[PDB]
């Protein structure tokens, strides 16, 4: 009785057309002929807003570049020409019987590739006597979002004990940014000398290495 949406992420180039798909395991028409299928948009930080109801009826205040269509078990939401403002998650939703939301489809603006401008940082003097020691690596402004990050202690790989945070695709330049932190103890950080950060991006099969040593 679920609603499945495709794709899980749609990359479109500004000005070009985007099309999200929503399918029901079965015929969702109400016994009155109406098909209470809706689409909603939620932008980061905001609350979900209504785009379309009953399959194709556009909601007042909603841009004309939004249209919806379908029947029985297949329904589509289309953005004739994507505007840079359109980034966010779109969700279809069945409003009849036992209401249910689709899994949602994230809209990303398809922009040109970019390599991670990395910069590593050594644990601050303040932190050292204050318990542990945290090494940080910022991988700012890059595209696409699919990237990976490995840490190395004296050339050796360090995968345990790290933490990453990503940032939603910036709405102006359309790039992503992530951060990796390595929390080693104080006695541990002191036991080694080399610390590195490498990022594997689809730009090339050649990583981007940035490092520092305790001197």
């Amino acid at each position: 009785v679920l609603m499945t949406q495709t794709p899980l992420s749609l990359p479109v180039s500004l000005g070009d057309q985007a099309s999200i798909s929503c399918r029901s395991s079965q015929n969702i028409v109400h016994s009155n002929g109406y098909t209470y299928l809706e689409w909603y948009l939620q932008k980061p930080g905001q609350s979900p807003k209504l785009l379309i109801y009953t399959v194709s009826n556009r909601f007042s205040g909603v841009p004309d570049r939004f249209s919806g269509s379908g029947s029985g078990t297949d329904f589509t939401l289309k953005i004739s020409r994507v505007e840079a403002e359109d980034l966010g998650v779109y969700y279809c939703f069945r409003g009849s019987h036992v209401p249910t939301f689709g899994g949602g489809t994230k809209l990303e603006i398809k922009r040109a590739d970019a390599a991670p401008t990395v910069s590593i940082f050594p644990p601050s003097s303040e932190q050292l006597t204050s318990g542990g020691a945290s090494v940080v690596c910022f991988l700012n402004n890059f595209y696409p979002k699919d990237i990976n990050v490995k840490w190395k202690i004296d050339g050796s790989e360090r995968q345990n004990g790290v933490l990453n945070s990503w940032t939603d695709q910036d709405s102006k330049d359309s790039t992503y940014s992530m951060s990796s932190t390595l929390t080693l103890t104080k006695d541990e950080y002191e036991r080694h000398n080399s610390y590195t950060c490498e990022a594997t991006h689809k730009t090339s099969t050649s990583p981007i290495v940035k490092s520092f040593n305790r001197n």
């Binding site: 209504l50 401008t117 940082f121 303040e126 933490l163």
Partner: protein, 216 residues
């Protein structure tokens, strides 16, 4: 002007419960179904249930029966939802919305959301840590930063130079590093020549501290 105003952020302990509200105004409360939607961090929208203030008629997603209980006080056009036996999974933003009819058949008006956080952890101030490059890289603009960790609860007011710097800034989502959160910010030649320091403040801890990024 239809408007739905929900109560503010909340923190409860595993096993405790919570009751949140949604005040409506601008329309006839008793003629529309009010819906409730849940959204966990980075997850999707999840329908919970609905109530008709006109007759207290209710319905719950099978998954929330017993977990969520809804009520509505008519004379005050306010709708409530109470969550019991809270767990880590009940942590999220909860919305209320109005099912409209006539000029549109859907959820046309939404509240702003009520963040609920479940944890047995305690209130702790951040430990902002200054971060500057260690000087080993091929470099007209340098990226330096600030770290914030071991703090609880959310959120943290992180600004650069009391609000002067906005671009070249990347503040990251507080992640969970052992009962407490940790976040970071990286700012992007006029340094260290001039002063560029970190301005972090914690409403909850009732603290405000600045860490001046001084070279090594």
């Amino acid at each position: 002007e239809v408007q739905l105003q929900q109560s503010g952020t909340v923190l409860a302990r595993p096993g405790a419960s919570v009751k949140m509200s949604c005040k409506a105004s601008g329309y006839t409360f008793t003629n529309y179904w009010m819906h409730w939607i849940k959204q966990r961090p980075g997850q999707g929208l999840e329908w919970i249930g609905t109530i008709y203030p006109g007759n207290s008629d209710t319905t719950y997603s099978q998954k929330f029966k017993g977990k969520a209980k809804l009520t509505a006080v008519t004379s005050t056009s306010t709708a409530y939802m109470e969550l019991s036996s809270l767990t880590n999974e009940d942590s999220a933003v909860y919305y209320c919305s109005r099912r409209n009819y006539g000029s549109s058949y859907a959820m046309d008006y939404w509240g702003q959301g009520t963040s609920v956080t479940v944890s047995s952890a305690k209130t702790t101030p951040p430990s902002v840590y200054p971060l500057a490059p260690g000087s080993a890289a091929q470099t007209s603009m340098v990226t330096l930063g600030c770290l914030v960790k071991g703090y609880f609860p959310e959120p943290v007011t992180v600004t650069w130079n009391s609000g002067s710097l906005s671009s070249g800034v990347h503040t990251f989502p507080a992640v969970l590093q052992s009962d407490l959160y940790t976040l970071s910010s990286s700012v992007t030649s006029t340094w260290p020549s001039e002063t560029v320091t970190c301005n972090v403040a914690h409403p909850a801890s009732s603290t405000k501290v600045d860490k001046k990024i001084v070279p090594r």
